[PDB]
Symmetry: none
């Protein structure tokens, strides 16, 4: 049985709550150099002007991690940081005021690294988004022979398990794929597999037109199931258009944000 | 109840094609020219043929439009379809004119001999009929029963059109459930798949700018295609009909439901 | 078995003051996206096209109001104009009387003897050429029933009958297009075309859904074709402004060291 | 000699992927980050992967990059290719770090390391860097010099019992690029790695590469391809898909 978006666990992200209500928070991400504070801030204010409620920035390095405080001081909406496995960058961004870190626990390595992150996260009440991706499933998951709905949830489970073992339940999860049937199938199962809020997203298509049609369709079928607490529409275009498609999708179903 | 999957629906012939009973959806659009202007309508259908359109609907508001069907036919490949709202003479004229499928409202037409001539006209010529229920066009008693347009009322209307034709030994039926509201559209099609075995023609009433029409159509149709129903479809957009085909092709590519 | 004729060996066919065929040049073309009857809009789109380097422009002539507007459009532009009419011969006669510089129509579609010889003699009198345009997606039913689906042999079967209708009227002022979506078919249709007849070929590829996909698919396909040494004129079809079509054609020709003259 | 069809080229493994012996080309891209900056590099690969990239090349200009190779692989799921130019040592380093393929042109020590790990070597021939003696023989860069340069390199590996070779024939002039791959395909049956060196703007490089590679693909050769652009690595994957997808050449 699927956990409706209204009975999912509430997760505080800055001043907003994701999960435990029927409000789909709109998110996006920047295209700028995260360490280029002026450019990043400029693009963020254009996203805020468009209707963006939460925005993510890639933190590939120290320059980027160092830019966090300077960015957040010049913005109004919550700022999430992208980090695949570097615990030092995780720690630097957290210290800097990020509102949430998108990091997959199982990639961090040795337990002491995993704890340095979770402890920092609890210290200032920041959540983690577990972001499962169809193109980047663990090497071992030689088990299915290719990305499948089952391989995504299992990878997801593994990541939640590490946080729950550390008494950490402030978690948001995403199951992002490029294929629509796999997309729908993945969120369906993750909703039946766990109670955390689901961050909806489909992989960027080659063109803006392809991506607009595919995402509108895939997320359309997921929202109709009563699931999803937040969403990000990924498109080969200026981020503002992602906010526009997201707004149009939610208005279409008569959904509030 | 059981949702009749698309592969479990009744196969009908629309020209040289088979709609229903399989796991593929045939793309359809409509010409924006006056059917009377032969070259104009052909020129537009040629662009749609080039684009990948598989079935095309032409305006048949009057007798001149109906009388040009054979001329259009000599110059194209794909099946020609036509919607007749009220006047049965237009349906009859279109049928004898060489149409491949007609969209009629048995209950509106009028006299029993009127419907019998069209049913027979279509039955004789071996042509299918499409029953198209539209949320904004429900019968008076339907709206009085439910109070406003609703999935159940569209389904009530559908069955009756179907029953009129079934009572005249007519079964080459395709059913459309067109609404503007996606929530209604999604429901309307889900209950139709549970209420009968005929193939369903998926369409959403166009609303807003091209940008909004494209998003809302993709959204609603995404939820319906994931339900495993739909055997044919058309995207409606105030734009060059070719754009409708583009959108339909992307949608099918996404789900892997193209012919 | 028959050798592909090299673009420099195709029959030279004059279009306006230009010569398509019997040379190593590739004439670049585009098509308007306006209503032909809207003279002002159409002439302004053509002027933008000329500015980007377009050499020949085709306009649809779907009704009588568009064919009567040919004369006034011609008076305002400096590049040869082309009427695209699928079969209505009263619309082509008007286009020809309007002073069109070429007509894109397939004679086997007209397709009544008094109707064919009329359009034929009218063109003969004005000394204007006819481009036959076979499109994989708009092939005749008797081809489809025979081959099953669109094939190169089928497109070649089609082109040959339209060509015969004309050759049988002692008309040889002909250019041929073989349009397909599938890049593999397009490539084979044009090599099969070069072996069957010596008429210069007009290279085109159906427009993909988007500008990006269209640019890649068309450069990849036409590049394949151009490298065989065939084709005498081309048109890129894109879901974009016609100016984008001219820019892709220029950069594509630039890539092969080929010129427009 | 007639050209060796892509389906008849000598199979070569790269990670879990086969390169050669089938009618489908593998998509490659290349990172732009500092290979020694691990999260940075991994982040780019992660976007590449998602976009449909199948193999990725990372620059190894020195030992910093060479040492990061292992940490990069424990994070990614597509095979990595190293690109070494002058130092035989950096290639040795990249191989110890688990590189899945080394693109390179002591000499026996590199092969022994390549033998030991069971990894191939992509001989990379380029029109912009042919040795002086073939330039002195042919006068300028040409298809005959390229194939001759590729054969002299193929010879040395073969004499050392190493046959797991993949070959590229890089040039900026479309007509030379075409002629070279045709020429290549005839001389040897090793799989071909298609690429066109970039020139001009993004617009210009997109048209040129698709045009050249289309002609090449039409001839039925090539088992792997790379679209060289000066932008986000995902733009190279975007061009590559449309191209392969248009010709009917799957993953
Ligand atoms: Cl570790
Ligand atoms: Cl450490
Ligand atoms: Cl727990
Ligand atoms: Cl009457
Ligand atoms: Cl409205």
């Amino acid at each position: 049985e699927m956990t409706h978006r209204t009975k999912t666990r509430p997760v505080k992200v800055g001043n907003l709550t994701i999960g435990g209500n029927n409000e789909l928070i709109i998110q996006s991400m920047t295209t700028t150099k995260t360490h280029d504070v002026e450019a990043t801030v400029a693009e963020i204010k254009r996203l805020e002007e468009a209707g963006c409620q939460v925005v993510r920035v890639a933190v590939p390095d120290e320059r980027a991690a160092n830019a966090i405080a300077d960015i957040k001081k010049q913005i109004n909406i919550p700022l999430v940081a992208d980090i695949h496995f570097d615990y030092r960058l995780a720690l630097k961004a957290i210290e800097g005021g990020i509102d949430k870190v998108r990091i997959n626990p199982g990639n961090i390595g040795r337990r002491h690294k995993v704890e340095a992150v979770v402890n920092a996260a609890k210290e200032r009440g920041i959540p983690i988004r577990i972001g499962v991706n169809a193109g980047s499933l663990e090497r071992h998951i030689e088990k299915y022979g290719y990305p499948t709905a089952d391989g995504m949830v299992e990878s997801a489970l593994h990541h939640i398990k590490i946080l729950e073992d550390l008494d950490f339940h402030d978690i948001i999860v995403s199951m992002k794929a490029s294929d629509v049937n796999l997309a729908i199938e993945a969120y369906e199962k993750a909703a039946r597999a766990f109670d955390y809020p689901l961050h909806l997203g489909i992989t960027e298509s080659g063109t803006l037109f392809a991506g607009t049609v595919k995402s509108a369709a895939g997320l359309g079928a997921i929202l109709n199931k009563g699931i999803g607490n937040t969403l990000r529409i990924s498109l080969s275009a200026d981020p503002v258009e992602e906010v526009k498609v997201a707004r149009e999708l939610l208005k279409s179903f008569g959904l509030a944000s």
